Amino acid sequence: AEIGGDHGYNATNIAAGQTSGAVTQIGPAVMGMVRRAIPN
Amino acid sequence: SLFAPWAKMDERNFKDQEKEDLVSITAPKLDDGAREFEVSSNEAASPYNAAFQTIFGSYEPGMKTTRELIDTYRNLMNNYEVDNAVSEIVSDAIVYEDDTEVVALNLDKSKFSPKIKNMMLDEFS
Numbered sequence A: 001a002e003i004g005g006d007h008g009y010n011a012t013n014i015a016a017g018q019t020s021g022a023v024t025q026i027g028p029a030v031m032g033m034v035r036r037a038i039p040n
Numbered sequence B: 001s002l003f004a005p006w007a008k009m010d011e012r013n014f015k016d017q018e019k020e021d022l023v024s025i026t027a028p029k030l031d032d033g034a035r036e037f038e039v040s041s042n043e044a045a046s047p048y049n050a051a052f053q054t055i056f057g058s059y060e061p062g063m064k065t066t067r068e069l070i071d072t073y074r075n076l077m078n079n080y081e082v083d084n085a086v087s088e089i090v091s092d093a094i095v096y097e098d099d100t101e102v103v104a105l106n107l108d109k110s111k112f113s114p115k116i117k118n119m120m121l122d123e124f125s
Helices: B004-018 B047-059 B064-077 B083-093 B114-124
Strands: none
């Protein structure tokens, strides 16, 4: 009755792909990035 | 947006290249041409940082290369026995005579139809 368990909403752990279940992840699927823009 | 109607085709052309399989090329597709500007795609993560450095990096020389050369070329041409070279070349290159031909389109290869040839010739004129 293996589960993937879950994360604690603790970014520290999430960032490492760490869950409470049978498996862990590689990391949290990076979604790209946002840089602040330059003014006119 | 003054040339937006032109841009419509240019955007298409660019996209046709994006949709093309001319990939896995280490070499630039640059034979003889324009100043090279390089950015990532990456959902436009930083084209603007590169653009500003490129713009001001270009501002530094201030196109002095082109600027000095054109001014130089003119200053050269402005001299005696220099214009003669230029003018003779131009004269030999572009020839006019009494009621004669000038550069002209010559459709001597297979064409879709004579009608198109006529259309092209009218456009050339």
